[PDB]
Structure formats: structure tokens, C-alpha cells
Amino acid sequence: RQYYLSKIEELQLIVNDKSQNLRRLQAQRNELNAKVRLLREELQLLQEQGSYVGEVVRAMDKKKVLVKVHPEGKFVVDVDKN
Amino acid sequence: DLYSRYKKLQQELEFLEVQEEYIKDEQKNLKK
């Protein structure tokens, strides 16, 4: 029994220490991957254009609103899902 | 029965080793 109990105790020690090591390593990976994902989504959004800037003159019922934008002028536009 | 638990802990150690190696490889790949 001495062999058996001694070796399982040893195994427990190394396993727990390496579990803490794994905690550290996994945390580092979970920060690096998060950062990489952040950068990727940033670039994907960076591909999208500048969407203009305008001011509304008169709402004219759901799905249609009038807005004036620099010298493009005043345009009527359907609102999005919001 | 203690043979079973000792072997289970041995497999736990080997699995943690696998995890550590995979995490090192993923760390290098993620850095690149």
C-alpha cells in the first residue's frame, strides 16, 4: 500500500501544480486571442465607408424622413431597423 | 481500487502535459 499511496500523493502534487500552470498559460492565451479578434473585427469595420452627416428637416411618417446633408443637398431616406 | 485512482491521476498528468504543449504551440501561433 505504501507504494500506491505515495505515488498517488505525488501525482496529486504534480497535477495540481500543473493545473495552476495551465491556468496561467490559458489566461495568457485567452487575452492574446481576444486581442487578435478585436483587431480583426476592427479591420473588417474599417472597410466600411463614412456614411455622411446630415440634419433632418421633417419626419414624413414611418420609413421616410427628410434630411439635409452638405452640398449633396436635402434627401428623403428610409430609416433602418432602429 | 487504488490502482485505478493512481492510473487516473497518471492520465490526468499526461493530459495536463498535452494541454501545456498545445498551449505553447497556440501561444506561438497567436503571437505570429
Swiss-Prot record, chain A:
What is the protein named? 26S proteasome regulatory subunit 8
Q: State whether it acts alone or in a complex, and with which partners, per the record.
A: Component of the 19S proteasome regulatory particle complex. The 26S proteasome consists of a 20S core particle (CP) and two 19S regulatory subunits (RP). The regulatory particle is made of a lid composed of 9 subunits, a base containing 6 ATPases including PSMC5 and few additional components. Component of a complex with USP49 and RUVBL1. Interacts with PRPF19. Interacts with TRIM5. Interacts with NDC80. Interacts with PAAF1. Interacts, in vitro, with the thyroid hormone receptor (in a thyroid hormone T3-dependent manner) and with retinoid X receptor (RXR). Interacts with ERCC6.
Question: Where do the TM regions start and end?
Answer: none
Q: Where in the cell is it found?
A: Cytoplasm; Nucleus
Which residues constitute the signal peptide according to the record?
A: none
Q: What does this protein do?
A: Component of the 26S proteasome, a multiprotein complex involved in the ATP-dependent degradation of ubiquitinated proteins. This complex plays a key role in the maintenance of protein homeostasis by removing misfolded or damaged proteins, which could impair cellular functions, and by removing proteins whose functions are no longer required. Therefore, the proteasome participates in numerous cellular processes, including cell cycle progression, apoptosis, or DNA damage repair.
> What family does this chain come from, according to its entry?
Belongs to the AAA ATPase family.
Curated annotation (Swiss-Prot), chain B:
Its domain of life? Answer: Eukaryota
| Entry's localization field | Cytoplasm; Nucleus
User: What is its biological role?
Assistant: Component of the 26S proteasome, a multiprotein complex involved in the ATP-dependent degradation of ubiquitinated proteins. This complex plays a key role in the maintenance of protein homeostasis by removing misfolded or damaged proteins, which could impair cellular functions, and by removing proteins whose functions are no longer required. Therefore, the proteasome participates in numerous cellular processes, including cell cycle progression, apoptosis, or DNA damage repair.
- Quaternary structure? Component of the 19S proteasome regulatory particle complex. The 26S proteasome consists of a 20S core particle (CP) and two 19S regulatory subunits (RP). The regulatory particle is made of a lid composed of 9 subunits, a base containing 6 ATPases including PSMC4 and few additional components. Interacts with NR1I3. Interacts with PAAF1. Interacts with TRIM5. Interacts with ZFAND1.
Q: Which family does it belong to?
A: Belongs to the AAA ATPase family.
Q: What is this protein called?
A: 26S proteasome regulatory subunit 6B
Its gene name is PSMC4
Q: Which residues of the full protein are shown?
A: 39 to 70 of 418
